[PDB]
């Protein structure tokens, strides 16, 4: 068993509406972890039981390279605890606002692991359906971990559909922003939001007023740079089609199409998620405590039903 | 750098 006070609560790593998540150290083993801690009175109050617990769900049973991984879970009368592997390389979010854009080797070293990790949810029946550059952590050696599972859907195999309007409004595929039901080829046109933020500096469809942003993602046409290789327009145009049924990667083979497609035929898919290829960068800290890839925003800032939700890992 | 997101359900 797991409590609060086997752990030293270190730094603030990152803070929403219905959690924080520290940097911690587990007092007996001196190994360095991110524990995400809800409050249930809150989580109860707001709905988010169902979104914690498919969080915790997607957590427990799901095991892949490019994943958050879950070390531990545990509860108080008050709290939930979820003990995570650390990614000492903080957010792409960060990383990209810093550099403004990638080379688009580095784009495709990203979107593959990215590519791996969705064909793996999707081959578990989940839908992740909140690809965005704030849900990708670079772990110590610089791989992509994708975070935030609570808005997955599970038990979506073949063409299954979903119907709750979620996700974040910036990344929002068009089919979403209509009535009734969509399928797992939404995480291909996330996958092409974050692929063109990374490739060409901004977002494909901005505005501050959601009312006119959802008008650009479902009437606007997306623009490149003169400069982008064809391979790289050819990629963002086939992820971010409107219609899901002619996306890239929204035919029956769903991952199979985007592996294939000419922008990655450098990459060898097993290489992936084997992880062979040196990444194109790795987070330079100097300690385990070292938090230089999180914004001074959280880590200057001082730190003072769910019947199956305790976990221990099998690793 | 674009202004932080933030997820949502309805
Ligand atoms: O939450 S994290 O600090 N960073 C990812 C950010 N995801 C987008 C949500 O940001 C707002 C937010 C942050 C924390 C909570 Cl509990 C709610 C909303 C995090 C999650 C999982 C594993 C991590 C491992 N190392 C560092 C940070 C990690």
């Known amino acids: 068993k797991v409590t609060m006070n086997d752990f030293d609560y270190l730094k603030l790593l990152g803070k929403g509406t219905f959690g924080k998540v520290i940097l911690v150290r587990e007092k007996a083993t001196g190994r360095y972890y991110a524990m995400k801690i809800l409050r249930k009175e ?3 109050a707001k709905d988010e039981v169902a979104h914690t617990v498919t969080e915790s769900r ?13 070390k531990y879970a545990f509860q108080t009368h008050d709290r939930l605890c979820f003990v995570m592997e650390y990614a000492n390389g903080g957010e792409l979010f960060f990383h990209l606002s810093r550099e403004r854009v990638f080379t688009e080797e580095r784009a495709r070293f990203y979107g593959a692991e990215i590519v791996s990790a969705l064909e793996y949810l999707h081959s578990r029946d989940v839908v992740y359906r909140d690809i965005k550059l704030e849900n990708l952590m670079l772990d110590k050696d610089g791989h992509i971990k994708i975070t935030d599972f609570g808005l997955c859907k599970e038990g979506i195999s073949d063409g299954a559909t979903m ?9 929002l595929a068009p089919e979403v922003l209509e009535d009734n039901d969509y399928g797992r080829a939404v995480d291909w046109w996330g996958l ?29 046409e997306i623009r490149f740079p ?7 327009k050819s990629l963002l145009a086939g992820l971010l ?45 100097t300690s385990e405590v070292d938090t230089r890839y999180f914004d001074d925003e959280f880590t200057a800032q ?14 | 750098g674009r202004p932080r997101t933030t997820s949502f359900a309805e």
């Open chain 1, 42 to 44: 809150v989580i109860i």
């Open chain 1, 58 to 70: 997607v957590l427990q049973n799901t095991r892949h390279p490019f994943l958050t991984a879950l």
């Open chain 1, 163 to 171: 119907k709750t309007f979620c996700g974040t409004p910036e990344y």
């Open chain 1, 192 to 220: 092409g939001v974050v692929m063109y933020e990374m490739m060409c500096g901004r977002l494909p469809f901005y505005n501050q007023d959601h009312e006119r942003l959802f008008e650009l993602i479902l009437m606007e």
């Open chain 1, 226 to 232: 003169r400069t982008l290789s064809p391979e790289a």
């Open chain 1, 241 to 285: 089609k409107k219609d899901p049924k002619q996306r890239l990667g929204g035919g029956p083979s769903d991952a199979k199409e985007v592996m294939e497609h000419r922008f990655f035929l450098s990459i060898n898919w097993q290489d992936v998620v084997q992880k062979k290829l040196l990444p194109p960068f790795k987070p330079q800290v």
């Open chain 1, 302 to 315: 001082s730190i003072t039903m769910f019947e199956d939700f305790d976990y221990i890992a099998d690793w």
